[PDB]
Design a protein around this ligand. Structure first.
Ligand SMILES: CCCCCC/C=C\CCCCCCCC(=O)O[C@H](COC(=O)CCCCCCCCCCCCCCC)COP(=O)([O-])OC[C@H](O)COP(=O)([O-])OC[C@@H](O)CO
Ligand SMILES: CCCCCC/C=C\CCCCCCCC(=O)O[C@H](COC(=O)CCCCCCCCCCCCCCC)COP(=O)([O-])OC[C@H](O)COP(=O)([O-])OC[C@@H](O)CO
Ligand SMILES: Cc1cc2nc3c(=O)[nH]c(=O)nc-3n(C[C@H](O)[C@H](O)[C@H](O)COP(=O)(O)OP(=O)(O)OC[C@H]3O[C@@H](n4cnc5c(N)ncnc54)[C@H](O)[C@@H]3O)c2cc1C
Ligand SMILES: Cc1cc2nc3c(=O)[nH]c(=O)nc-3n(C[C@H](O)[C@H](O)[C@H](O)COP(=O)(O)OP(=O)(O)OC[C@H]3O[C@@H](n4cnc5c(N)ncnc54)[C@H](O)[C@@H]3O)c2cc1C
Ligand SMILES: [Cl-]
Ligand SMILES: [Cl-]
Ligand SMILES: [Cl-]
Ligand SMILES: [Cl-]
Lengths: 395, 395
């Protein structure tokens, strides 16, 4: 356990919250600083595969999360132009038996609130309205500066300040890399959506330079919709690229089922999609970058928040194993071991994710090949998914 | 049979020769005019699938053709960059039982000479050094003009003057469509080629914007090599595009096994690859376009000469069936029925051929998809090949 340890967490997104919970459950003294004046997340969906579900179950929060979630029966890929089913990933008992938990979907806001509530219940001292301005290592302590003029001492610090991380600048001068794709979201009352057939699955329509995803939320009561498309504005050097004037044309070549979808999306805000080139070293002295600060992906594998959750489980588990006997002196080794375990995993998701999205967005003959590949696969094989859903940090 | 019939054939390539043989075997009076001063073809390879072999066997020329041919055991597709085997098409007893004959390869020159010799033996009057300048229909005869000032009367005429057909202008004003790919050939003494492992198959290396094909000829004594690549010069408007200064760079990204291949090719002559948009009507009065004059393909399905051979079998068979009772008055109906049977077949080869070549030349993620598609196919299924190799005109 981590009783005498002190950890400061910079950032209170899903990653920071998950880390607060994991560490506080091990008995650590956790202090978390979040810049925003309230904890919160977007009231739209995310997908959590069993690689995340199993961890939430270990922390004792999965039953509760599931009480407000949706359990899809399959992931269904469809051609965005013909609406033809290409393949399905079955999420039933064989799947859940293999991977140790369910694939579920839920509101980001709910998942976040649940983690925050559990972290507080486990003893984590959470602070909103507080920006971490600097982290340095002096001797065997991390010294953390905040925007009220104060400094704070801890054994380690977690840089969990997201894609646009300023703490990352301590380790890397790299900048976010534009995908040239923009994402729009929407949630609609289920019944309020015009559907030919009912939706009980995650449905992804994949087409030339675009995709469109639908899944239910909150026990079937709401439908989440997500449109991602290649922005003409980006390649022309627009700074505020991917705006909603681009949507109609981006989907004009698609099936009516996809086109009808566009009307339900929120249009007042959107998410231009950036990632970063993978980096091997996430550690500066007694600071480690985790979550999006370390490994921000494009969302095709729907695993960014899951990675941050996995980061929390690995850090907590590895620290509790080593700190118990080695104490505070052991932290730099612990952070090195966590980085060594996490970097190859996460970096593969970053790189493979890029290719996966590319595979979704193919056109012409390449699309014809892609479609046939999907249709004719061995659906009993797990070779495409075991590396993702079957991973564990347990040693 | 066709005893009282007179047919004039404009053009003496593989198609004209095959038509001369088929018609003369039915007892027709055949006169063929070839522009060149000698009959001849390029002394390089072609591939003849069982859709052609079965027809040659019917004409009694297959045993003889095979005595100078090579019988490959498989068609092997390899990645041009890694040299990895992707898939094989087995050409063994199951294949030959399904499709009614062998897939073989041979010299174009030999195949052509064999057809010409058989046509002469069957009674066809062949003329070299004679250009057909015009064909018109007057009453119930085709009137054929030649470049010595003479005119000739026949019941029908075949326009078999190839890709650059001037007789086609009677029916269509279309022009050849550039693929932007150029083809080089070579034949080398087998032993004279530097091979890591021996070649007993048709081997096709498929890569980004290029491919490279190898197969033995003449019982294993020679190796045929064919390089096809996308020409940078074509897109820049060079008139004489695809020249050999482009070869080294076109293959620079490929495996050594492919790169070594380039050195064996003839460099003093090359074949820029053009086809034509498919057309439905090939008939003008008592003239029918056949062979490349009607349906010139890009050579990815290796079926252009085979199509011309199929044209000969269908024309001869359908005419012999109908002329016997209807006589000369029946020819326009016969030509219509041949066109009706042949156009959908041949036009599918033209169009599918284009996509097939595109599938060979993919790059990036599309290549990754294509490779996996090929590797994971049901190799017992014939769904990709039955439409091609299992076709027959027999009614
Ligand atoms: C499972 C759905 C269908 C995916 C089918 C095609 C995917 C990729 C084809 C191209 C990649 C070929 C890779 C060949 C080697 C291979 O299988 O590696 C395997 C690793 O494969 C990979 O590493 C494949 C990477 C592709 C990702 C699959 C994605 C899983 C689905 C994510 C769903 C997210 C939410 C969806 C929202 C709509 C290991 O092969 P080995 O076991 O033989 O060694
Ligand atoms: C046989 C080698 C591997 C070819 C594998 C992938 C080819 C194409 C994938 C894309 C096309 C998907 C078509 C799906 C529908 C289909 O199967 O149609 C089928 C028709 O498929 C087609 O019409 C496929 C067209 C692709 C051509 C296959 C080429 C045969 C090999 C030629 C070799 C030439 C010489 C090589 C020199 C190196 C009918 O399907 P149904 O029976 O279910 O109806
Ligand atoms: C369109 C889209 C769809 C997605 N869908 C999925 C999905 O289905 N499943 C999945 O697993 N992932 C998904 N992701 C990825 C996921 O949203 C992220 O990987 C994840 O939320 C990152 O969490 P984080 O806590 O590391 O960073 P963030 O969410 O960015 O949180 C960082 C926090 O730190 C705060 N902050 C910044 N600087 C400071 C500072 N200096 N001091 C204090 N606080 C600071 C911020 O206010 C913020 O709250 C998706 C992403 C996108 C863009
Ligand atoms: C690089 C390449 C590889 C190929 N590989 C294969 C393969 O493996 N298998 C396959 O089946 N096919 C293959 N083909 C296709 C094949 O070569 C052709 O489809 C086929 O030869 C066409 O035969 P044809 O008799 O219709 O026309 P052509 O071969 O063009 O013959 C037309 C003839 O008419 C003559 N002529 C022109 N005008 C007149 C006139 N006005 N009067 C008299 N004579 C005239 C010409 O001199 C010529 O001899 C390939 C083609 C290329 C370019
Ligand atoms: Cl993601
Ligand atoms: Cl992801
Ligand atoms: Cl051809
Ligand atoms: Cl062809």
């Amino acid at each position: 356990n981590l009783q005498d340890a002190r950890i400061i967490i910079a950032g209170g997104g899903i990653g920071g919250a998950a880390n607060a919970l994991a560490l506080a459950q091990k008995g650590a003294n956790v202090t978390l600083f979040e810049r925003a004046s309230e904890f919160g997340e977007v009231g739209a969906g995310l997908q959590v595969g069993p690689h995340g579900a199993r961890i939430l179950d270990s922390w004792g929060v999965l039953d509760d999360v599931l009480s407000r979630a949706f359990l899809p029966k399959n992931i269904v890929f469809r051609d965005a132009i013909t609406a033809e089913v290409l393949t399905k990933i079955d999420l039933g008992s064989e799947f859940r038996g293999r991977y140790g938990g369910p694939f579920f979907v839920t509101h980001r806001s709910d998942l976040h609130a649940t983690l925050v509530d559990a972290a507080r219940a486990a003893g984590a001292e959470l602070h909103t309205g507080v920006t971490v301005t600097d982290v340095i290592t002096e001797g065997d302590k991390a010294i953390v500066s905040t925007d009220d003029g104060r400094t704070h001492e801890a054994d380690i610090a977690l840089g969990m300040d997201g894609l646009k991380s300023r703490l990352r600048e301590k380790i890397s001068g790299d900048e976010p890399v534009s995908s040239g794709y923009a994402a729009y979201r929407g949630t609609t009352p289920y019944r309020d959506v015009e559907l030919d057939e009912d939706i009980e699955d995650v449905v992804g329509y994949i087409g030339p330079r675009c995709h469109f995803i639908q899944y239910p939320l909150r026990g079937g009561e709401m439908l989440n919709q997500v449109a991602v498309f290649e922005s003409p504005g980006f390649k022309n050097g627009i700074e505020n690229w991917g705006g909603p004037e681009e949507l109609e044309q981006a989907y004009a070549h698609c099936h009516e089922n996809v086109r009808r979808g566009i009307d339900y999306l929120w249009k007042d805000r959107w998410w231009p999609m950036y990632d970063r080139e993978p980096i091997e070293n996430w550690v500066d002295g007694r600071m480690i970058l985790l979550g999006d600060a370390a490994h921000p992906p494009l969302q095709y594998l729907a695993s960014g928040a899951v990675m941050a959750i996995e980061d929390a489980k690995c850090l907590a588990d590895y620290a509790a194993e080593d700190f118990s006997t080695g104490g505070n002196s052991a932290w730099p080794q612990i952070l090195k071991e966590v980085n060594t375990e996490r970097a190859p995993r996460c970096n593969r998701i970053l790189t493979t994710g890029r290719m996966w999205g590319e595979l979704w967005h193919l056109d012409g003959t390449a699309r014809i090949a892609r479609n046939e590949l999907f249709r004719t696969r061995d659906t009993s094989s797990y070779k495409y998914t075991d590396w993702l859903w079957g991973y564990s940090s347990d040693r």
